[PDB]
Structure formats: C-alpha cells, structure tokens
C-alpha cells in the first residue's frame, strides 16, 4: 500500500469543502514512533500556507484556526524541521472554499431544422469554486422524460441526441436544469415549449437567378429548402444601398415575376423561410448571391 503521509497525519474541521466565511481547524498530529531522531528544544513542527509560515509547535500536536479564507484552494503543508537536517515534508491538506451554486435564470431549447438534435442553453451564474454537475431533463405531455448529465465543470449547452418527433404540432414539452455541488443544489424554473417554438427552419441551401428566360428586368429566383415551409421572405434591396426586403413571399420554391432593376449591375440576394407564421422562428438569411 503506497501511503502519501508516513511521518504524521493532518486533520481539517469541519471539512476540506467549507462555505465562504467559515473557519477551518487545520491540526497537524505526529505519530509517536516517527519524530526527530535526537530530542532537542530546537526542532519545530511548522505549518505553511503556499510555503508561508502560520504556526510552530515543538510538541507533536499542532493546532491552527485559519480564518477569512478567500474563494479558491489553499495548500496547507506541515513540515518537520530538525536540529541540523533539512525540513522533511510530513503531510498536507488542500482546502477548497466554495459558495452555494447559482440557479440558471433563463433556459432555452433550440432544434436546428425539421430534422435536428434538441440543444438547451442556460446562464450558469457566478462560478462557485467547487466541482459543478449539471443535469438537463426534458419531459413530454405525460411524464415520460429524457435526462442527460453534463459532468464537465463548464458547459456551454447540453444536446439530446434523440430527435423530437411531435405527436401533434401543438404539444407542450417542459425542460428543467439542476446544478448540484458539495455545499448546495439549485434548480431552474420549469419552462414549457410547444414544438413550433423549439424548431427553427434551416436557411435555404439552394439559390438560382434567372431573368424570366429573357433580357427583361423581371427576375425569377429558383431556391430550395426544407419541405414544410408555409411562408418565406426575399431581399430585393439594391446591392449598393440596402432599402427594403418584402415581409412575405408566396409558398413557391421558385420565385416568379419578381420586380428587379433594369440594369445588370451585381445585386446581393438573401433568402429566409418561416416554418409556421403563428409560432415559428425565422430562418437565417441564405449566403448572399452576387448579381
């Protein structure tokens, strides 16, 4: 059995993890068999924080009560100094000062495209100086559920690998995030999302410009995107200065008889689609098409 501390053992009261503001009783105790080979009233049993002397007792039992510890870890190492020999490190304690975990104030779940993996994002709050474990739970109408745990201390987001297929377009799904640390536990308020709110249409991948198969000013734009789109929007703004973009386009993959400027000067084109007008987010504008 490998043992880190052989000469003596050091105890901490109440524990290595303490609430910000508490006082720890670091006590260095030396086993009777171990000790300075020659008894002398010169040898000492020092205690050091970051190699800084805090106490010194000739006797094997050393007691200290450190206070006002800041957030972080402080290494208290208790070395033995003999009469002529160099100091031998005996044992030490690492103390993590921590505070109660922040509750996530805002939780949002976004699925990219009709086929996508749901991803939920939260505001962690102040960082407790402690290991942090995050649990994300998603439940449907009745209480079935999916849970995943983000063991990583810092998590940008947690993604449910399982895709969500909604039994009906109007359903209620509720998501909650729980943060647990040695000192305490904070749980976010339940947030209820309908499937349309979670889904976000993909930007239209395709784009084509045709001048109505003619030299005429009128232009026809042939783009392609996800099948379930009941709305759309197009940018007809002149390239040199942005002006106005039509709020809505008809449910046509291929634009027809769009009003375009008579010159053939290059014009930037951007396109967006809305899965549902009543409760669907707008898609990101498609890569600009030059001319």
């Amino acid at each position: 059995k490998i043992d880190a501390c052989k000469r003596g053992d050091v105890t901490v009261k109440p524990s290595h993890v303490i609430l910000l503001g508490s006082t720890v009783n670091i006590t260095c105790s030396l086993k009777p068999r171990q000790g300075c080979f020659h008894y002398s009233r010169r040898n000492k049993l020092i205690l050091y924080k970051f190699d800084r002397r805090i106490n010194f007792h000739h006797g094997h039992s050393l007691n200290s009560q450190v206070t006002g510890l800041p957030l972080g870890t402080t290494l208290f190492v208790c070395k033995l100094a003999c009469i002529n020999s160099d100091e031998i490190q005996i044992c030490g304690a690492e103390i993590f000062v921590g505070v109660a975990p922040e509750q996530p104030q805002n939780l949002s779940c976004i699925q990219k495209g009709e086929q996508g993996t749901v991803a939920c994002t939260w505001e962690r709050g102040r960082d407790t100086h402690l290991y942090t474990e995050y649990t994300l739970q998603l439940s449907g109408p009745k209480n079935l559920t999916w849970q995943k745990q983000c063991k990583d201390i810092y998590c940008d987001y947690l993604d449910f690998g399982i895709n969500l297929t909604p039994e009906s377009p109007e359903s209620n799904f509720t998501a909650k995030v729980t943060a647990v640390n040695s000192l305490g536990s904070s749980s976010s308020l339940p947030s209820t999302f309908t499937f349309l709110d979670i889904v976000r249409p993909l930007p239209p991948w395709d784009i084509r410009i045709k001048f109505q198969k003619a030299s005429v000013s009128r232009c026809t734009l042939y783009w392609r995107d996800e099948g379930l789109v009941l709305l759309n929007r197009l940018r007809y703004r002149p390239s040199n200065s942005r002006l106005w973009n039509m709020v809505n386009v008809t449910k046509a993959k291929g634009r027809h008889d769009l009003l375009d400027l008579k010159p053939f000067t290059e014009y930037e084109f951007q396109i967006s689609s809305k899965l549902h007008l009543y409760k669907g987010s707008w898609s990101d504008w498609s890569e600009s098409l030059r001319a």
Binding site: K49, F50, G72, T74
Partner: protein, 149 residues
C-alpha cells in the same frame, strides 16, 4: 539618415522608401523585386543592382504591450504580450513566433512560444525580454522588448 563615426571616416547612411504599387493582392511571390541605385559624384557615375524577396528581407517590429502579471501564491510570473499593429492583418494568415529570454543581468533562458502569454520564474535581479520572427519562414529577428522584473 545618419552620420555615425566608424573609425574617423564618418560613414553617412542614405535610404529610400519604396512601396509595391501592384493593386492585385497575391498569396506568393514568383519574381524577386530589383532595386537599382545610380550613384553620381561630380563627373563620376556608378550603378548598383540588388534583387530580393519581401519575405526574406522582412524584419518584425518589437512585441507590443508586454506586461508581467504574477500568479497568486506561486513563484512563477505569467507574462502577456500582443501582436504589433504595423504587422500585416489578419494575424491568422500571417503569424509570428515569440522567443522569450529571461537572462537579463542561466546563459540561455530563451524559450520559443507561439502563444501570446508564457510563464517564467522571475529572479529579482533580472529583466525579461521578448523577440518576434516570422513563424512560417526564417526572417531577421526583431529588437528585444524588455520589461523590468
């Protein structure tokens, strides 16, 4: 430009400022730039021709905003520096390598770090100095930037 006294001759240094006026940007150079100086003195005429590439003659200016930040309760000190504004942008396509020597006033404390922050134990009686060179190709080393430690 200057009137130094090498020996007793007092050599005088004359310099020209030349800018490539090519509008089209190009990733790599295939032709060396050629410079001709038609020196004229009284009734005597001489001409000198030099051929070179911009990357070969490039010499970076010293690293900017060098500051030392001691780590809490540790002997080592973190030192952070920033890219020179004069150097071409973006800083991703064109990159520099920083060599940090802590010898100040053991012979060679030079450490080559691509990162803009390195941590070096600081003896109270020495200075920490940083140098910049083109990371991609061998280039003339920059002037040392020294911050007292």
């Amino acid at each position: 430009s200057a009137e130094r006294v090498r020996g007793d001759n007092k050599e005088y240094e004359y310099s020209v400022e030349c800018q490539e006026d090519s509008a089209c940007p190009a990733a790599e150079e295939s032709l060396p730039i050629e410079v001709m100086v038609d020196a004229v003195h009284k009734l005597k005429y001489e001409n000198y021709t030099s051929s070179f590439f911009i990357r070969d003659i490039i010499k970076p200016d010293p690293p900017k905003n060098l500051q030392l930040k001691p780590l809490k309760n540790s002997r080592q000190v973190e030192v952070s520096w920033e890219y020179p504004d004069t150097w071409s942008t973006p800083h991703s396509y064109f990159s520099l390598t920083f060599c940090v020597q802590v010898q100040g006033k053991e012979k060679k404390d030079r450490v080559f770090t691509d990162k803009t922050s390195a941590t070096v134990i600081c003896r109270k009686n020495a200075s920490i100095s940083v140098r910049a060179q083109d990371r991609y190709y061998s280039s003339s080393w920059s002037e040392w930037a020294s911050v007292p430690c």
